[PDB]
């Protein structure tokens, strides 16, 4: 951290705080870790299968199963480099809300 590098990962959760916020030194535990209960890892394409008249579009997780977006996700850094136009269009509004 003296050379402006940082360990660990990154969390994108909506935190509507009013008091103290410390992004670099998070108090207590992290919300979830890869492989936790009801935590899914995105597949290597980052693809999204769009469901039709009234259902919600779903990410394609590790494997081939389409899992729904609203929940928890572990986005590896390489997938985010080839799916940012699909990140910012679908899952990132479900981060903001």
């Amino acid at each position: 951290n003296l050379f402006n590098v940082a360990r660990g990962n990154l969390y994108l959760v909506q935190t509507a705080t009013n008091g103290n916020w410390s992004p670099m030194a998070p108090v207590a535990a992290p919300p979830f870790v890869r492989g936790g209960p009801n935590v899914r890892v995105v597949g290597r394409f980052g693809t999204i299968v769009p469901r039709p008249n009234g259902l919600e579009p779903q990410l394609i997780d590790d494997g081939n199963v389409p899992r729904d977006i609203a929940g928890d996700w572990v986005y590896p850094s390489d997938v985010l480099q080839v799916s940012v136009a699909v990140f910012r269009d679908y899952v990132w509004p479900m981060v903001k809300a």
Partner: protein
């Protein structure tokens, strides 16, 4: 004989008469086909 679809009351729907006579009045289907145009999003597997 040319018109069993118009005249004959024992005519079965779809029954032609091809080998001998050109039945001149038949019960056809008319297909209103729709041709889809495929245009999707193309992905790429990431590094590692």
């Amino acid at each position: 004989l040319r018109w069993p679809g118009l005249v004959d009351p024992n005519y079965r729907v779809g029954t032609n008469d091809l080998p001998n006579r050109i039945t001149l009045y038949n019960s056809l289907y008319r297909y209103n086909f729709t041709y889809p145009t495929l245009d999707g999003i193309m992905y790429v597997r990431s590094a590692t």
